[PDB]
Amino acid sequence: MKKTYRVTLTALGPIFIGGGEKLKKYEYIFDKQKKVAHMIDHTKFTKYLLE
RNA sequence: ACGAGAACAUACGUUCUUUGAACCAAGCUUCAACUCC
């Protein structure tokens, strides 16, 4: 009879769903030597280079 | 030197009036953005 339940999925390990977006060696990826990575948007990158 | 001669079966008149090709019906069902090294 439509037994609705609230599922709280506790991520005990690394959870990855992907979704079809591959990031190449230097293609939108910005990896620096302080053990964090930043990533960029294609539109503002391309117009920031074309300006 | 014909039961004959002469004589439009003719004139007038809307296949027309009223009438939803409608009513009902999920583009949906089942799918891990993934496996290997």
Automatic annotation (TrEMBL):
<protein>
    <recommendedName>
        <fullName>CRISPR system Cms protein Csm5</fullName>
    </recommendedName>
</protein>
<comment type="similarity">
    <text>Belongs to the CRISPR-associated Csm5 family.</text>
</comment>
<comment type="function">
    <text>This subunit might be involved in maturation of a crRNA intermediate to its mature form.</text>
</comment>
